[model samples]
Target: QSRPASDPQVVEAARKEGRLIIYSSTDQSSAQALLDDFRKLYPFIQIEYNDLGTQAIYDRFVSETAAGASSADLLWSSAMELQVKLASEGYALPYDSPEAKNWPANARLGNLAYSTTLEPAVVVYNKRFLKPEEVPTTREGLARLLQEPRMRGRVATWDPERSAVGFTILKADYDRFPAFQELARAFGKAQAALYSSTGAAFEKVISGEHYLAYGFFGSFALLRQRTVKDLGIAYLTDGTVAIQRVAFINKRAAHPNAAKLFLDYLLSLRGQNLMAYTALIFARRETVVGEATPQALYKAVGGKDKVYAIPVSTEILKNLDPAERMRFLTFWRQAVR
Candidate 1:
């Protein structure tokens, strides 16, 4: 079950010549599809996959690389900063992908890492609980909703500290709109109930524990809509921040060629279809509707008006280790509580 990023021909020549190992944060279903499809494309390659929490993956990577047991061919995750941090620490290998040049400026990291999937941060509401007109469309719009007598005490969110995207939403607020800080402070005074996981937050919203939620995205919202008719997500008319999942070859990898081929497949139209199958959308500008679920995801990805972004170069996020990330979370905990 060893797939090194070095000497691709020899690696590929191994039994199940196409065998590979991937570490990812794209969630179990998404990662599972990626591995399954890769096997389908290169039937000779067997996949040994590790689907861990993004932060946990980073911690494991640092330890594994430090111990000189680097065996994984690829590292993929939704934690943009951490993935880029790995690139910075020399954990990832830099290989030129044919798909690299065509990727959007904001989406690719100059061959260091590349974003393959787009997941927009959104505000979701229960249709049965509030009218479309009542949902906020802008900074001012949301400000107005918070103070409305009927809307008081009707919001839920994942603990920004625990959920990577949730923290990105917080950073987006601070980096793009000052009003968001004020909004959070206001919610703080109102005693907003913050949960530890997205599922918990989703439950509170669907069960009416809370009427609304921030940091709600397409995946959970769509899953809910299938069974919970009243629940739905809204893309704020003014715009919302969209964070994407990225992948790269580990410099310490034992299978560079396999990693390259795997990456090519990931960024290819064929790979894009696999992602669409998992209800994930690509970052490429053109909408890929080859699959109905991905088509729906494309609509979800594009409906937003503004996209707040974290430039890959700064690598500011990568600098924040677990201790620092926790301190940041502690601030958010008090800010929202």
Candidate 2:
């Protein structure tokens, strides 16, 4: 089948393709609910979803496309910078979703990419072990807490050099916060345990193997806390880094119409609500509810001013540059090693 001619019903065109390939960074369990709901709405469409590390998703998509083979129809990731980088480099299909009007300007990248979920990077710890007094409410406080002798070798965090999402967050921290260097030094002194994924670092905290873990997705941590007893999350009184999960269609998508349909449904009001309640990650402000909403997240972080929202734009691609990335990693390795 070829591209549907002018203004045909999207649902009909998408039904003809009847399949979609998605490459995403979201853990399968976290995305299952939404995908299940979507399946109900478009039962005819076959969904092939791959949950991978953020870097792996990007690498696989690029490599597959470059080899003139089939690749994912849609690319969704928490690493917004990677998405932006791809879009800016002409790898993304420009899509104008009808739901775009519902989101803020930063949520839309001139139809190249869209923000799908609101996630905050938070401080997670083992509540069963750490005292209320020992819990740090701010980044500076966290630095001090990690400096204690007992905290040495008990701290956990993402390995920026390995994890793409981790590198984006740490790079953002370096740019927005003056105390980021101090925090890095503190992590080095504590000999922090680092992992390539949030689940890994978070698991250590849940098992009491690590007293505290920094830069974990708060929504995921909250869900974990509900399922278990030991986990606790802090929004950092000084600042909370909220990340927008970016989703874009591949320029060489085999089923472009199907991909577009999926994108629109994913960003629609009902979809965003499902994300907030079922998926546990809040996205659109109109669909936001409870304490996990963007408004609540801002308040939890001390206010909008304190919330460092990672935008979906070229600016995010700056630190990902080869020379700049090397310099950043050099500084980071010196502190952590």
Candidate 3:
């Protein structure tokens, strides 16, 4: 098989390094899918993969870099804000990929970060308990639905104050929807259950313990299709948030040449396909098929116009502001409790 389109000299230089370390927020199985392919293509380049919490990945990388210790060569995460902040703060290397042109314009962040998958935040419900007709398609509808006596104490979602990932998505929700505050109060008024992990909230929904769940990662729900047969996912009619799992080369990467090569391969057609199969959430529209593609997802949800995409940018840093975060959390606690 022919080598990928990276410069021959760079490829040679990367092979000389012969190793790479990737710190990721994606689960082990999905991350392994891409890593396995990369290994086959460049057997000489050994890989050290670490699957950690989104915040943990960012924090540890920052700590290591600050201490002048070896850290991840590639930092990939669903915590788009954290990664973008790292890059914007000069912790990421700038390397343009030749294959970047093939992806959507929003996928690349001036060569500092790359969006890898299109994972939408969606409302998930128990198909066994809630009929399609009863499902709420907008945040406003969801709040109203929870007002029904039967739906009380049966809704679950991430605790934005506790989970960094949850906070990121919910912050974007606040940015997109005017009814966000009302929705928060409705959740509290209905005695909604809160959790720190998507899997935890989804488990309640799948078990029929919760009739509805909000802000569940759409790809995560699909990934559990065989196990959670009654689980259903839907985008809000008003707008559903889509979070991109971005990757960037560490500015102080021990293997800069190898990092660049891997980053390009990730954006390449083959790598993108592998990511789609594993994550079941493809970034590039042209590379996906069936229900996994953006077109299919958007069509199934509502329409492209209803998709409130959170781009990889420094604007997200606003949510991470301590004072702002605390202010929202205070408001959220009072509203929910």
Candidate 4:
């Protein structure tokens, strides 16, 4: 519960520590913007940023903690359930960021883990392929499009078996609608490609190999759309699921003070500005106004009624339950086949 940024003692201690190691699933290109700003403010502290996949981040952090050697000071990722699982298991040091007090309960896990962004999954497509009238506005609509000759064999999504982010968003849809089977079957009928990475799916969309990619983070989708004028975004009207990237300070941190400083900066307005405007990522704070905020997305898509913000809780752990997960995967396979 320490707002270390305001405390001179904490800042001095962090300066002496002089280093912070981060293991994050966020791609370095996007994360580097914030890291660059972080260093400018605290040039005395050196940063060791390791970009790894979501599952890899989880495995490495756990393995390093068990080994009891020097390891990351911070662990951050878009794998909502897995990251919360770590925090709940007591691997996170309690840190009540000064910016977290006014946040909703779901934005943090009792000062142990805090969500850094309010990102949502969306339908990213090629503008040249899907006209405004043809773009799917809802899952059912997407299913309809998949039935057409033009759309067939040209849509894609993350393979839930390989991607926690994909599983979480798909699971959200599964929870909200009774017709999920219909949508999954449509994907199968369309011969939709299943990718292990959203980025992989995006590349296909970029190349026109796949015209549409579902369950993609809106922020990253926008980033691609900026470079490729032909890319388009359509937030599902039935309720777009929001994925918040959560982060925690490692309990066995080698640079606890330095890590605390970086974490605080992440939750602060200045760091959030870079995330929203520069990196084109959504910031968790409503006050962090720019092109990418939950409020702005809601306004652009329709309203708050159209966006579902998944909470930070043990409920997410359901996805990791071996028996239940296998059951869903089997069911998913059957539908997607």
Candidate 2, 177-296: lDDT as tens digits: 777788998999999998988888887877887889988788888778778877877787777777899999999999888888778777876677777777678565554666557777
In candidate 3, stretches whose alpha carbon ends up further than 4 angstroms from where it belongs are: 1-4, 102-105, 282-286
Q: What tens-digit string does per-residue lDDT give for candidate 1 at 214-262? A: 7665656665676788886776545566666778888876666667777
Q: So what's the TM-score on candidate 3?
A: 0.93
Best model number under lDDT = 4
Per-prediction TM-score to the true structure, in the order listed: 0.84, 0.91, 0.93, 0.95
Question: In candidate 2, which residue pairs get closer than 3 Å at backbone N, Cα or C atoms, i.e. clash?
Answer: none
Comparison by lDDT, 1 against 3, better one: 3
Error of model 1, residue 247, in angstroms: 0.9
Choose 3 or 4, whichever is better by TM-score: 4
Best by TM-score: 4
* Candidate 3 lDDT score at position 134: 84
Model 2: weakest 10-residue lDDT segment is 1-10
Give candidate 2 regions above 4 Å deviation: 1-8, 284-286
Supply the TM-score for candidate 2.
Answer: 0.91
> Which is the better candidate, 1 or 3, if ranked by TM-score?
3
Q: Which stretches of candidate 1 lie over 4 Å from their true place?
A: 1-17, 281-285, 290-305, 318-335
Ranking according to lDDT, highest score first: 4, 2, 3, 1
lDDT, residue 252, model 4: 88
- Give the winner by lDDT: 2 or 4: 4
